Design a protein around this nucleic acid. Structure first.
Ligand code: ZN
Lengths: 177, 49, 141, 117, 76
RNA sequence: UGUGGUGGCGAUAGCGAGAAGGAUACACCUGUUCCCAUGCCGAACACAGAAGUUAAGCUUCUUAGCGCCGAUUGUAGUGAAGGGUUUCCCUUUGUGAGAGUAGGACGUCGCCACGC
RNA sequence: GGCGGUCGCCUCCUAAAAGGUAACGGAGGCGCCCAAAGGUUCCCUCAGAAUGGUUGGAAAUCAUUCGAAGAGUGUAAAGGC
RNA sequence: GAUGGAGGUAGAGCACUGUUUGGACUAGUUCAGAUAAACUCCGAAUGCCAUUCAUUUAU
């Protein structure tokens, strides 16, 4: 779609030269994108995962999973298997459209332009964004929203050393500092 | 809550089997397809009211 | 008195010492040792009495290693009670010591202070003893 | 990330198929290999540890199609060739695959041309 | 005045036929809890882990790889 | 011979470090029309393929750092037969460890297919 | 002797490397539960730790890398997996 | 007497669970040294089960 051209036409020559890759298999990629919502409020009101899921599906053409307890802790009134949050996974074209709407439309709606921190790379080459609310997107609306909540993002790639992903990630967008 | 029980055939009316159940878990009557020895055949047995 | 925190069993059997030490028969951390030549039980109070006597004599300190720990409990019944019902209540702690075991170690102090201190510790104890030094290996300073 | 190889994940299922299936000389073992461009087949007895017949996908002379149709030819070939050695009573080891796709094609062709399963 | 004092009946577990002994079909070889020993050629497992012959032959206790044991029965 | 497959033998067969290789084969890789699939996702499993590449798996070769297999002689115990106080200790005769070591070891045996 | 406790059944130690073995010896459980928590066919692999991530804190839920078992097994403990 | 076998005791060991002494360290793992009846990576002497076996013997 939009970036396969961009890879095979701007970036793969760059990255293949910057680290002197003897093969093109060696060039990193983007494998997944996984979205998280930590609700933690089906504890009280059962009608909270519902809105979380409505918003996340307004984003992407995909009904999200439902993550449950996985154990029972009394600090949060948790039994086992109390459905807590929802998640989504994105392959192929769902990833490039979503990255494009992240870099070119949605993200800059956030003010105080701190972009993306750099203590955010796991030490192995995958990256995780951060979002506080939901209003940052053109798929969301004004009134329908009722809570200030936002979503976690993780972008996983095939890279050994962090800096390789640093470049392969800035080169496609994601306006770092 | 657990109670012993008898399952009775539905064509020849012979109480062929003894078994259990929990009657707050299963409120209605059990129903199984069991070999009936009088007719040498598999038949719908049902629990005695 | 030394006491084990948190035993797993409240009572246990007693026997059967049948002397010969299984473990530390050489000096490990100090320069001078106190080695038992008979086999007997050694209690909390005997160890503390020996330790206090040994440390008081060494003005300017030095160092002292206690190498014997009471793991095993006692029991006992009371006067005026006939034989019969289950074991008595536990009263005490002990360690079994078999002949060969080094029990204390001292360093940082010349011979005579160390020898006098080990002499004073042994009169507090129910065993016969020798005094030993680190003798000869690949390295003994 | 580390994608695992598929061949080890199917060795791990093959070793559990084989806790039941095994082949003697009255009832040899019809095995199957399925690679990215072929499928193979051997007829194996295990007390002696040997092969009694075989047929391979695109090694010898099969072609006339390159859909699943390559498999049915191999099934028919091992059927004929094993009936040449006095063999009718084999047992089918799937490998670790499903009895579903182009392994089912080979198996079916085996059952039409001489081998009772 | 003690609160102990109870036990269960002993169960007579162990080996019931020897290595190198001839045996008729169906005879018990070993009573156990769980598979301390495993079944081998011509031997079955019961409902509570007992091992039995299926065929008449001699009994041979063997080694199953590195850390397990096996019983087999071999007819003449 | 080389490679693919499928088997026996207690890892002496394993782990980690290092190199090399694409002849066929093995793989990664490319797609979702059709058989089938995701408690979301063609990721997997299923199928249609053959642009691209030896980077990763795979194969071969070097390495005794980690595991594994370890003798010999000395002890500790203990069958029989005897002696002191009998808590415990000792002497004859037979058996003999666990530790700790000298050494071994980077597999060995077999069937099928194709290529040289 | 009385008062106190105990009286059937299961698991461990005592018990002396087959089986068996006392004491008002040392420790615990049972008098049920499950219509699936039974049968069978396919498929799967755990507990933790470290790193990042908005609410969210040590610890709910996401991603990666180490991880032979340090988990689970309706219910006591042993033997198994 | 010879040959095969089942089994965890006497040792002694710290891989697993309890109990425990010194030292280095750091997050803000390590080096040594002990110990056990209900601990075990290990493991005897003897006893026990067998055998178309052998030599004496009489059950
Ligand atoms: Zn009837």
């Amino acid at each position: 779609n939009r970036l396969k051209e961009k890879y095979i036409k701007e970036v793969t020559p760059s990255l293949v030269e910057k680290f002197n890759y003897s093969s093109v298999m060696q060039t990193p990629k983007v494998d997944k994108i996984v979205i998280n919502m930590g609700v933690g409020d089906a504890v009280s009101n059962a009608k909270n995962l519902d809105k979380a899921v409505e918003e996340l599906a307004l984003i992407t053409g995909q009904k999200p999973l439902i993550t449950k307890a996985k154990k029972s802790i009394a600090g949060f009134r948790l039994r086992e298997g109390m459905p807590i949050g929802a998640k989504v996974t994105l392959r192929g074209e769902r990833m490039y459209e979503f990255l494009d709407k992240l870099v070119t439309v949605s993200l800059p709606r956030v003010r105080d332009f701190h972009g993306v921190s750099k203590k955010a790379f796991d030490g192995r080459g995958n990256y995780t964004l951060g979002i506080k609310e939901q209003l940052i997107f053109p798929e969301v609306d004004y009134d329908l929203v009722d809570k200030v909540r936002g979503m976690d993002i993780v972008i996983v790639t095939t890279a050994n050393t962090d800096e390789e992903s640093r470049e392969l990630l800035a080169q496609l967008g994601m306006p770092f500092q | 809550m657990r109670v012993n029980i008898t399952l009775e055939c539905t064509s020849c009316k012979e109480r062929n089997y003894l078994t259990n159940k929990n009657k707050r878990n299963n409120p209605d009557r059990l129903e199984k397809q069991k070999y009936c020895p009088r007719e040498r055949k598999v038949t719908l047995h049902r629990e005695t009211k | 008195m030394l006491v084990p925190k948190r035993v797993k069993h409240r009572r246990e059997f007693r026997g059967k010492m049948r002397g010969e030490a299984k473990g530390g028969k050489e000096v490990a951390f100090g320069e001078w040792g106190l080695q038992a030549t008979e086999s007997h039980w050694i209690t909390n109070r005997q160890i503390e009495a020996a330790r206090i006597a040994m440390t008081r004599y060494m003005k300017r300190g030095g160092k002292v290693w206690i190498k014997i720990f009471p793991h095993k409990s006692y029991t006992s019944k009371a006067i005026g009670v006939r034989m019969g019902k289950g074991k008595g209540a536990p009263e005490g702690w002990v360690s079994p010591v078999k002949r060969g075991k080094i029990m204390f170690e001292i360093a940082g102090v010349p011979e005579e202070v160390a020898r006098e201190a080990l002499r004073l510790a042994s009169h507090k104890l129910p065993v016969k003893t020798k005094i030993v030094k680190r003798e000869e290996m690949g390295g003994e300073s | 990330i580390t994608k695992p190889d598929k061949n080890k994940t199917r060795q791990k299922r093959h070793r559990r198929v084989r806790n039941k299936i095994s082949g003697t000389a009255e009832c040899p073992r019809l095995n199957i290999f399925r690679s990215n461009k072929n499928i193979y087949a051997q007829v194996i007895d295990d007390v002696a540890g040997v092969t009694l017949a075989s047929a391979s996908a695109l090694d010898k002379e099969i072609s006339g199609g390159t859909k699943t149709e390559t498999a049915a030819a191999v099934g028919k070939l091992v059927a004929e060739r094993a009936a040449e050695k006095g063999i009718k009573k084999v047992v089918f080891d799937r490998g670790g695959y499903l009895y579903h796709g182009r392994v089912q094609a080979l198996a079916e062709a085996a059952r039409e041309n001489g081998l009772e399963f | 005045s003690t609160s102990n004092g109870r036990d269960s009946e002993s169960k007579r577990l162990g080996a019931k036929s020897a290595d190198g002994q001839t045996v008729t079909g169906g005879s018990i070889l070993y009573r156990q809890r769980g598979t301390k020993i495993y079944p081998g050629v011509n031997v079955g497992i019961g409902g509570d882990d007992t091992l039995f012959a299926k065929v008449d032959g001699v009994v041979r206790f063997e080694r199953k790889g590195r850390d397990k044991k096996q019983v087999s029965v071999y007819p003449v």
